[PDB]
Design a protein around this ligand. Structure first.
Ligand SMILES: CC(C)c1cnn2c(NCc3ccccc3)cc(NC[C@H]3CCNC[C@@H]3O)nc12
Lengths: 279, 65, 286
């Protein structure tokens, strides 16, 4: 359960500033190692963030075309693995192209989505020799990925909390007559939230509730009563204020999100290839 | 030194979740899919899925890092 | 890494376990899915009657898991003819097992491998559920499970009849079996095959009918059987009291839904009644 999970204890951070500090520390640690091994070949932390967002998009595409069909739980677990890995590791050391596939592989194992290794690597659009090379690299990096996650493999996604909130709305909130007309727009907002860093900053229940109430606001429905009358927050107004602040901050994180740009990702990809050639 | 049952005290940092046996009266089970006869024969009930969904929805809703 | 690798402890299909300075270290598909299952489940759980995963580390596709060191298990206790299992001892073992199971079931996980040698005991007499290699999360309508979990002598009839969806009953039945093995000092239902296991179950407890198991005929491997009336529980457990017989009947109810859950078993008068469970420090030591 989330309330005593490793995700809550160790992978839910206080602010975007702490995440930026971890990412910058990883960047400077790789820079120091590269210098001690021996210039503008190095990637700046914002460039690393752009590449990580691009490769998270690539991981989502890979998990969406995966055959047999990958449960949404596996995709969420893999994306969380990618986010956690590149919090404390530079893309200049470990290539995100390999790391995202390793994330998907480990996620399929952890969430009990049994697929054999050949049918995993067959989903890749490469030659059989290329598929076996990718398989070898995934096997090399699986233990590394597990180590960098600190052996915290269970990821609590917001999809089941979303379902629970829908059940609760259908049962206890007749004001919102048909909660199922919120599902599509709330799912779209959930995808948008997943693009950002919110999965490292908020609880899955908070994320699901934020998506639901954003969908309700988009439809024009004002359902603060459900927060006050059904969640019993009218008995604790400070908790209600904290909850509204959390949801406002999440909506702000979504509105300020900037997607990777094609020219910029092309330039940074050539830079990353140069980085990996020399290492 | 007689044993006395104490319920598990685990803070959920969220709203109270209705008990499993009470889901039927409160109307929750009218919104979860019914359990098939083979599901019931093995001990699986729609109450389990509904209860887990509600618990996950309410877990840590009021918690902040 | 930081461990001394003192003594060899055991070897099984997926791993070999050694003592190490005190902890127990257990050493193209990649990392073994049983080790990953143990890692992913035991990291999220923390309870006095559940085995603790203290550390994890490995090389290549070979990971080593660090657990607390356990002195013995219930199998050695049951098979040791020197020690006498007083009713207090059975109550204590049952209580620790059921509390660990209550915690585990609260977090929507089924052990699916309960048996006396999977219930380990430390020097302080604390019983911990171990061997989470088959343990799986339950309560999800999208997860389809296999019916070949639990060793045969402790497998529930719905599992033997091929249930792909089940709940805590598969643990609870095994618990009942363990209880019976504690009372008889021998395996309760020692079948040599699935059909023989079902035969022994129905010959001992009676063949369940549609009144005691409303949808028993809908299980995919349900086989129509011979109507045995069974043997009354007070005849099998001649030394058992009425409260213990109530607990046994609840644990061995053929309907998995009607079968008592861990919390319901804990609330039963058997555990509240005299005598109280033995303290851990006074439980018998093999
Ligand atoms: C890996 C962890 C669960 C563990 C902690 N102590 N310990 C011991 N101790 C020696 C022992 C135990 C039981 C009976 C006699 C001796 C033995 C052992 N053997 C591996 C299996 C064997 C079958 N029963 C479950 C065990 O985990 N695994 C462990």
């Amino acid at each position: 359960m989330y309330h005593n999970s490793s995700q809550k204890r160790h992978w839910t951070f206080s602010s975007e500033e702490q995440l930026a500090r971890l990412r910058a520390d990883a960047n400077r640690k790789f820079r120091c190692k590269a210098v001690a091994n021996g210039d503008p070949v190095f990637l700046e932390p914002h460039e690393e963030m752009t590449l990580c967002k691009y490769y998270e998009k690539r991981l989502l595409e890979f998990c969406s075309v995966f055959k047999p069909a990958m449960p949404r739980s596996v995709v969420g677990t893999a994306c969380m693995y990618f986010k956690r890995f590149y919090l404390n590791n530079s893309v200049m050391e470990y290539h995100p192209r390999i790391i995202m596939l390793t994330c998907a592989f480990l996620a399929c194992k952890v969430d009990e989505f049994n697929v054999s290794s050949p049918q995993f690597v067959g989903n890749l659009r490469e030659s059989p020799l290329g598929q076996e090379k990718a398989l070898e690299q995934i096997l090399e990096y699986e233990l590394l990925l597990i180590q960098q996650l600190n052996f915290h493999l269970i990821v609590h996604n917001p999809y089941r909390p979303f379902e629970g909130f829908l059940i609760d709305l259908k049962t206890r909130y007749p004001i919102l007559e048909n909660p199922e007309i919120l599902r599509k727009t709330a799912d779209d907002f959930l995808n948008r939230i997943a693009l950002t860093d919110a999965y490292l900053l908020y609880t899955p229940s908070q994320i699901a509730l934020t998506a639901i109430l954003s969908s309700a606001s988009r439809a024009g429905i004002t359902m603060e009563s459900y927060l006050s009358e059904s969640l019993m927050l009218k008995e604790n107004r400070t908790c209600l204020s904290q909850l509204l602040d959390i949801m406002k901050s999440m909506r702000n994180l979504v509105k300020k999100y900037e997607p990777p740009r094609s020219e910029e990702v092309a330039v940074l990809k050539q830079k990353l290839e140069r980085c990996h050639s020399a290492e | 030194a007689l044993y006395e049952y104490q319920p598990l005290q685990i803070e959920t940092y969220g709203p109270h979740v209705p008990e499993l046996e009470m889901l039927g009266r409160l109307g929750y089970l009218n919104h979860v899919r019914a359990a098939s006869p083979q599901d019931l024969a093995g001990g699986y009930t729609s109450s389990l899925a509904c209860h887990r969904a509600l618990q996950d929805a309410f877990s840590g809703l009021f918690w902040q890092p | 890494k930081r461990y001394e690798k003192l003594d060899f402890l055991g070897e099984g299909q997926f791993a070999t376990v050694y003592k190490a300075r005190i902890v127990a270290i257990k050493k193209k598909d990649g990392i073994n899915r049983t080790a990953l299952r143990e890692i992913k489940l035991l990291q999220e759980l923390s309870h006095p009657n559940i085995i603790g995963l203290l550390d994890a580390f490995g090389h290549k596709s070979n990971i080593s898991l660090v657990f607390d060191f356990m002195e013995t298990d219930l199998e050695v206790i049951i098979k040791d003819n020197s020690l006498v299992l007083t009713p207090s001892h059975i109550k204590a073992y049952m209580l620790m097992t059921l509390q660990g199971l209550e915690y585990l079931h609260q977090h929507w996980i089924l052990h699916r491998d309960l048996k006396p040698n999977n219930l380990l005991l430390d020097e302080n007499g604390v019983l911990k559920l171990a061997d989470f290699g088959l343990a799986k999360s339950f309560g999800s309508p999208n997860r389809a499970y296999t019916h070949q979990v639990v060793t045969r002598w402790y497998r529930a009839p719905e599992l033997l009849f091929g249930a792909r969806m089940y709940g805590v009953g598969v643990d609870m039945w095994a618990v009942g079996c363990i209880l019976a093995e504690l009372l008889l000092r021998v395996p309760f239902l020692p079948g040599d095959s699935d059909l023989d296991q079902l035969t022994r179950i129905f010959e001992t407890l009676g063949t369940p009918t549609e009144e005691q198991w409303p949808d028993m005929c809908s299980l995919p491997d349900y086989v129509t059987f011979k109507s045995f009336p069974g043997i009354p529980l007070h005849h099998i457990f001649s030394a058992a009291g009425d409260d213990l017989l109530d607990l046994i009947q609840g644990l061995f109810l053929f309907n998995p839904c009607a079968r008592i859950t861990a919390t319901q078993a804990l609330k039963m008068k058997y555990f509240s009644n005299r005598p109280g469970p033995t303290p851990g420090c006074q439980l018998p030591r093999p």
